[PDB]
Design an enzyme around this catalytic site. Structure first.
Site, PDB file in Angstrom:
ATOM      1  N   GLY A  41       0.813  -1.395  -0.114  1.00  0.00           N
ATOM      2  CA  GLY A  41       0.041   0.355  -0.368  1.00  0.00           C
ATOM      3  C   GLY A  41       0.842   1.161   0.100  1.00  0.00           C
ATOM      4  O   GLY A  41       1.768   1.315   0.268  1.00  0.00           O
ATOM      5  N   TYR A  90       3.117   3.435   0.940  1.00  0.00           N
ATOM      6  CA  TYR A  90       4.399   4.276   2.470  1.00  0.00           C
ATOM      7  C   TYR A  90       4.078   2.677   3.512  1.00  0.00           C
ATOM      8  O   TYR A  90       4.399   2.499   4.557  1.00  0.00           O
ATOM      9  CB  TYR A  90       4.382   4.994   2.766  1.00  0.00           C
ATOM     10  CG  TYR A  90       3.992   5.980   1.881  1.00  0.00           C
ATOM     11  CD1 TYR A  90       2.709   7.065   2.410  1.00  0.00           C
ATOM     12  CD2 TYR A  90       4.588   6.470   1.066  1.00  0.00           C
ATOM     13  CE1 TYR A  90       2.614   7.846   1.206  1.00  0.00           C
ATOM     14  CE2 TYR A  90       4.624   7.540  -0.289  1.00  0.00           C
ATOM     15  CZ  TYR A  90       3.145   8.670   0.749  1.00  0.00           C
ATOM     16  OH  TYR A  90       2.987  10.001  -0.323  1.00  0.00           O
ATOM     17  N   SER A 140       3.538  -1.705   3.820  1.00  0.00           N
ATOM     18  CA  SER A 140       2.437  -3.327   3.651  1.00  0.00           C
ATOM     19  C   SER A 140       1.181  -3.393   4.158  1.00  0.00           C
ATOM     20  O   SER A 140       1.101  -2.940   5.333  1.00  0.00           O
ATOM     21  CB  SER A 140       3.210  -4.867   4.214  1.00  0.00           C
ATOM     22  OG  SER A 140       4.065  -4.929   5.333  1.00  0.00           O
ATOM     23  N   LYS A 144      -2.678  -2.028   7.006  1.00  0.00           N
ATOM     24  CA  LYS A 144      -1.650  -1.235   6.597  1.00  0.00           C
ATOM     25  C   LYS A 144      -0.725  -1.023   7.272  1.00  0.00           C
ATOM     26  O   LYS A 144      -1.010  -0.224   8.709  1.00  0.00           O
ATOM     27  CB  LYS A 144      -2.115  -0.357   5.676  1.00  0.00           C
ATOM     28  CG  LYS A 144      -0.331   0.062   4.920  1.00  0.00           C
ATOM     29  CD  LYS A 144      -0.550   1.962   4.547  1.00  0.00           C
ATOM     30  CE  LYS A 144      -1.021   1.668   3.579  1.00  0.00           C
ATOM     31  NZ  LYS A 144      -1.160   3.153   3.265  1.00  0.00           N
ATOM     32  N   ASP A 204      -6.487   7.232  -1.594  1.00  0.00           N
ATOM     33  CA  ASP A 204      -5.152   7.401  -2.727  1.00  0.00           C
ATOM     34  C   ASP A 204      -5.217   8.906  -2.499  1.00  0.00           C
ATOM     35  O   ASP A 204      -4.602   9.701  -3.577  1.00  0.00           O
ATOM     36  CB  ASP A 204      -4.515   6.876  -3.451  1.00  0.00           C
ATOM     37  CG  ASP A 204      -2.863   7.240  -3.753  1.00  0.00           C
ATOM     38  OD1 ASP A 204      -2.667   7.107  -4.377  1.00  0.00           O
ATOM     39  OD2 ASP A 204      -2.253   7.518  -2.552  1.00  0.00           O
TER      40      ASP A 204
HETATM   41  C1  LIG Z   1      -3.059  -3.459  -0.494  1.00  0.00           C
HETATM   42  C2  LIG Z   1      -4.006  -2.191  -1.265  1.00  0.00           C
HETATM   43  N1  LIG Z   1      -5.194  -1.635  -0.657  1.00  0.00           N
HETATM   44  C3  LIG Z   1      -5.007  -0.540   0.057  1.00  0.00           C
HETATM   45  O1  LIG Z   1      -4.062  -0.134   0.377  1.00  0.00           O
HETATM   46  C4  LIG Z   1      -5.931   0.055   1.072  1.00  0.00           C
HETATM   47  C5  LIG Z   1      -6.095   1.136   2.235  1.00  0.00           C
HETATM   48  C6  LIG Z   1      -5.848   2.420   1.276  1.00  0.00           C
HETATM   49  C7  LIG Z   1      -4.934   3.732   2.016  1.00  0.00           C
HETATM   50  C8  LIG Z   1      -5.562   4.843   1.261  1.00  0.00           C
HETATM   51  O2  LIG Z   1      -6.006   4.899   0.237  1.00  0.00           O
HETATM   52  N2  LIG Z   1      -4.898   6.275   2.062  1.00  0.00           N
HETATM   53  C9  LIG Z   1      -4.983   7.506   1.877  1.00  0.00           C
HETATM   54  C10 LIG Z   1      -5.096   8.227   3.029  1.00  0.00           C
HETATM   55  C11 LIG Z   1      -5.837   8.214   1.660  1.00  0.00           C
HETATM   56  C12 LIG Z   1      -5.095   3.443   4.083  1.00  0.00           C
HETATM   57  C13 LIG Z   1      -4.461   2.337   4.129  1.00  0.00           C
HETATM   58  C14 LIG Z   1      -5.384   0.525   2.953  1.00  0.00           C
HETATM   59  C15 LIG Z   1      -4.925  -0.408   4.517  1.00  0.00           C
HETATM   60  C16 LIG Z   1      -6.974  -0.218   1.596  1.00  0.00           C
HETATM   61  C17 LIG Z   1      -7.939  -0.882   0.257  1.00  0.00           C
HETATM   62  N3  LIG Z   1      -8.902  -1.467  -0.224  1.00  0.00           N
HETATM   63  N4  LIG Z   1      -9.059  -2.648  -0.932  1.00  0.00           N
HETATM   64  C18 LIG Z   1      -7.457  -3.114  -1.370  1.00  0.00           C
HETATM   65  C19 LIG Z   1      -6.804  -3.942  -2.244  1.00  0.00           C
HETATM   66  C20 LIG Z   1      -6.404  -5.171  -1.549  1.00  0.00           C
HETATM   67  F1  LIG Z   1      -6.714  -5.668  -0.923  1.00  0.00           F
HETATM   68  C21 LIG Z   1      -5.568  -5.703  -3.053  1.00  0.00           C
HETATM   69  C22 LIG Z   1      -6.155  -5.134  -4.049  1.00  0.00           C
HETATM   70  C23 LIG Z   1      -6.176  -4.379  -4.453  1.00  0.00           C
HETATM   71  C24 LIG Z   1      -7.181  -3.530  -3.827  1.00  0.00           C
HETATM   72 CL1  LIG Z   1      -7.340  -2.069  -4.812  1.00  0.00          CL
HETATM   73  N5  LIG Z   1      -7.063  -1.415  -0.684  1.00  0.00           N
END
Ligand SMILES: CCn1c(=O)c(-c2cc(C(=O)NC3CC3)ccc2C)cc2nnc(-c3c(F)cccc3Cl)n21
Length: 349
Positions: free
Chosen positions: A30, A32, A34, A50, A165
């Site tokens: 994610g 900054y 894991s 995260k 994001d």
């Molecule tokens: C691992 C990717 N992912 C994420 O990083 C987040 C996430 C996103 C944020 C975020 O957008 N932060 C910015 C201030 C807005 C903060 C914390 C988390 C855990 C949500 C989230 N929801 N679904 C996913 C996700 C996933 F878990 C697997 C594959 C694709 C995606 Cl998009 N994610």
């Protein structure tokens, strides 16, 4: 009242999480840090946890940790990622070094669902409606996303969407170089730094995403900044006199004036076989002059979303206090502010 924590080796670090979070499984990377999928026993939700990597190693890291936390804490909307929980194993500020962020876990991103499914006009209607619903909320908080793209749009099995994001930006020069999806959704005024940009930058991005969902093709897949600009100006036309004087950069203006002038293309001829309402809306999003682009609120009221549009269920946010961005503080000071934000967090109902 402090919860009980337990330790566990995930990736190559020791994760220390409250007992409520069970069956942690690495799900990639994610912003900054894991990320692990987990089952939240208290809410009954599959969640994403995260762990921030090195949250206070520098001033820039300490401030962006604070920035991400403030951003997440502010957002309380169905179509925008928000904070279910935030925690640290630390019992004091003196030992406080790790931050864990907990959000809803949507199964995948927009890229993934396009890979596995062929989407209909209704899917597109619903997906774009939710992006705009979330964006109206984000913009009403006086926040610019500035990095809207499919990989930042989290989607589950029910076609429900949350925007990720927002408000971070700053993808490095190299990450934005060449034939890369990181740049394909960006408004031309930000891509080549023509001016002080506004939130309609995000509307351009929506237009690029919507076109791609309809056609199955990237709208402006430039091999570099200039190739992409040429692709953009081919469709929407070269700038007129009015927009030219809005471009504050003198070199940028000089370059634009060198280009052979082109009219806007006929969008009905580009997007053949598409809903004429989709084409109309796309025309209003993909306007070169950012002042003249449709807003998220205006787009929600467009006839294309008639079956989804509910003015009573499209909420707005409180203003987001961004004054800290102009503030210059030491690491320990950013760290202390972050700690306060962690301990002061009150869970959603
Ligand atoms: C691992 C990717 N992912 C994420 O990083 C987040 C996430 C996103 C944020 C975020 O957008 N932060 C910015 C201030 C807005 C903060 C914390 C988390 C855990 C949500 C989230 N929801 N679904 C996913 C996700 C996933 F878990 C697997 C594959 C694709 C995606 Cl998009 N994610």
């Amino acid at each position: 009242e402090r919860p009980t924590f337990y330790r566990q080796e995930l990736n190559k670090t020791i994760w220390e999480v409250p007992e409520r979070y069970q069956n942690l499984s690495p799900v990639g990377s994610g912003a900054y840090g894991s990320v692990c999928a987990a089952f939240d026993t208290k809410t009954g939700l599959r969640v994403a946890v995260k762990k921030l990597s090195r949250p206070f190693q520098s001033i820039i890291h300490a401030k962006r940790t604070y920035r991400e936390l403030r951003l997440l804490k502010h957002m309380k909307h169905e179509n925008v990622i928000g904070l279910l929980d935030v925690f640290t194993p630390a019992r004091s500020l003196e030992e406080f070094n790790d931050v864990y962020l907990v959000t809803h876990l949507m199964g995948a991103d927009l890229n993934n669902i396009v890979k596995c499914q062929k989407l209909t006009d209704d899917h597109v209607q619903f997906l774009i409606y939710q992006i705009l619903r979330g964006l109206k909320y984000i913009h009403s908080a006086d926040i610019i996303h500035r990095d809207l793209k499919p990989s930042n749009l989290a989607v589950n099995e029910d076609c429900e969407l949350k925007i990720l994001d927002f408000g971070l930006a700053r993808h490095t020069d190299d990450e934005m170089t060449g034939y890369v999806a990181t740049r394909w959704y960006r408004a031309p005024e930000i891509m080549l730094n023509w001016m002080h940009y506004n939130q309609t930058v995000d509307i351009w991005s929506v237009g690029c995403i919507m076109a791609e969902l309809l056609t199955g093709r990237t709208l402006f897949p430039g091999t570099d900044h200039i190739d992409q600009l040429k692709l953009i100006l081919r469709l929407v036309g070269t700038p007129g006199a009015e927009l030219l004087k809005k471009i504050s950069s003198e070199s940028a203006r000089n370059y634009i004036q060198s280009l052979t002038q082109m009219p806007k293309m006929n969008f009905a001829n580009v997007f053949i076989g598409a809903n004429p309402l989709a084409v109309d809306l796309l025309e209003k999003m993909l306007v070169l002059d950012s002042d003249k682009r449709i807003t998220a609120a205006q787009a929600l009221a467009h006839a294309y979303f008639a079956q989804y549009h509910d003015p009573d269920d499209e909420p707005v946010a409180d203003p987001y206090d961004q004054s800290f961005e102009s503030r210059d503080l030491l690491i320990d000071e950013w760290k202390s502010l972050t700690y306060d934000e962690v301990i002061s967090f009150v869970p959603p109902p």
